[PDB]
Curated annotation (Swiss-Prot), chains A, B:
The chain holds residues 27 to 150 of 150 of the full protein. It comes from Bos taurus (Bovine). Its main location: secreted. One of its GO terms (biological process) is defense response to Gram-positive bacterium. The active site is at 12 (proton acceptor), 119 (proton donor). This is Ribonuclease pancreatic.
Length: 124, 124
């Protein structure tokens, strides 16, 4: 079992590239980050900034999460991100994803000591 | 009680302006669209395009919703939107919102005949 922080890293962090490298980026990343094992994870965002910069969001703008929790934080600056969403004829175990690159603020829920991201809520 | 389509219009449509008019836009709009009556709605997005253009998204890119439903659609083009999120010392009945303007693709769930938006899923 993963810690919540490590799960966030596995699902949402890609500091190895400044942006999605091709239209196949999501197909590749959803598979290699183990998000297509038991089901096709329907929606998932990757962040192309340093882990330090993403962790730093937990000390930025405190805002509500979509579910009403009060431990969400919005990045002061925009960040390079990639949205991955099931599309076309995606059907487990043949998952297929649309890759959409953007530059947006991210909103994450933070927990723990150290206080780090544990859930990706949205991007603006 | 509202139809799902009318609720979407009340919560998410603002064709009267090309973008949020001030930092107080969300405070004003969340109140006047009756989203602060029983609770402070934590998060809500307004779309500044014509109703026709937003309805048209139901005939655009079919993608998964965050919850795994298959009736979501992503706009081919970006749209002017405003994200409203509770912030600071927001506490019912004294709701307070952060206003964040952006240009992004929208993702909506569609239902019915006519097939129209009934839920705002996310923006990319």
């Amino acid at each position: 079992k993963e810690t919540a922080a490590a799960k966030f890293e596995r699902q949402h962090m890609d500091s190895s590239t400044s942006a999605a490298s091709s239209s196949n980026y999501c197909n590749q990343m959803m598979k290699s980050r183990n998000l297509t094992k038991d089901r096709c994870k329907p929606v998932n965002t990757f962040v192309h900034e340093s882990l330090a910069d993403v962790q730093a969001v937990c000390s930025q703008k405190n805002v509500a999460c979509k579910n009403g929790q009060t431990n969400c934080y919005q990045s002061y600056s925009t960040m390079s991100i990639t949205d991955c969403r099931e599309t076309g004829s995606s059907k487990y175990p043949n998952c297929a994803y649309k890759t959409t690159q953007a530059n947006k603020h991210i909103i994450v829920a933070c927990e723990g000591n150290p206080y780090v991201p544990v859930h990706f809520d949205a991007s603006v």
